[PDB]
Amino acid sequence: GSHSMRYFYTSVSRPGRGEPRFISVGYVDDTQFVRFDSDAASPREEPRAPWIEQEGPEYWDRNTQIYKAQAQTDRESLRNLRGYYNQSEAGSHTLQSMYGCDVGPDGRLLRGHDQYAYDGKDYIALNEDLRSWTAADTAAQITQRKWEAAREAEQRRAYLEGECVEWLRRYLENGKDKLERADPPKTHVTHHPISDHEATLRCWALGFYPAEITLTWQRDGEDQTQDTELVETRPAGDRTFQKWAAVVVPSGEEQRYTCHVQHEGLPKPLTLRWE
């Protein structure tokens, strides 16, 4: 299938309390596989998925040095940024970075990603062409002019089209069923009397991977979108996800309601009922 690799970096300044805290995490699709935290006792890239543990000590050692250098670079960026925005040197600011590659079933690069946000707002993004930038404002234009003059996009293309795609392809091979085969949800309906005239029907989807899923209630085959309470998809803490959809129904009318489940792991879309 189609797959993604993404690195997510968060730098948070704390002027007076030392260098900004740098945290990195790496994902393949919805699976986290690495982390680094500048505030750990011995900062190093650590595994967070079983299938990366096989990578040798030079993998871990290279990546650790890259994160330590990136923490220093981000520290410099935050200084430049408070300067560009004419902000106080006393306050805490956030720099987030998100980069990686989307690849199709053939494992060819579909799209490259390389963007930044300052204080939770879009700042600069590499465009789909991977050769030009979109700056959000005049501050971001300073970064843009510098990175154009330095041919930064050209330097970054190499990683997105090369190492990003080849290491993703590697991780996908080594993850095997964990990354390439969808885990279908375990589904059930529960019934929660509110009074003698109303009851809640709750349709559960548990232990599924990846996160993408659709849950809907239907009354006599008609979608009940207006009257469905749908919780945001949430992590189980074991690399799988959960979701539920609930509808309030008149007592004795339960038989009119069906829950409909769409997920990549199911042989076909499921219809469930109170049973």
């Binding site: 690195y7 990195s24 790496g26 690495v34 890239e45 993998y59 290279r62 990546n63 890259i66 994160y67 250098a69 990136q70 670079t73 410099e76 960026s77 430049n80 940024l81 720099l95 980069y99 930044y116 700042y123 600069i124 970064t143 990175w147 330095a150 930064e152 330097q155 970054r156 990683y159 190492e163 990003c164 290491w167």
Partner: peptide, 9 residues
């Protein structure tokens, strides 16, 4: 694997 990139904003 993460990229090596030393460019500041």
């Amino acid at each position: 694997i993460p990229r090596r990139n030393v460019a500041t904003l």
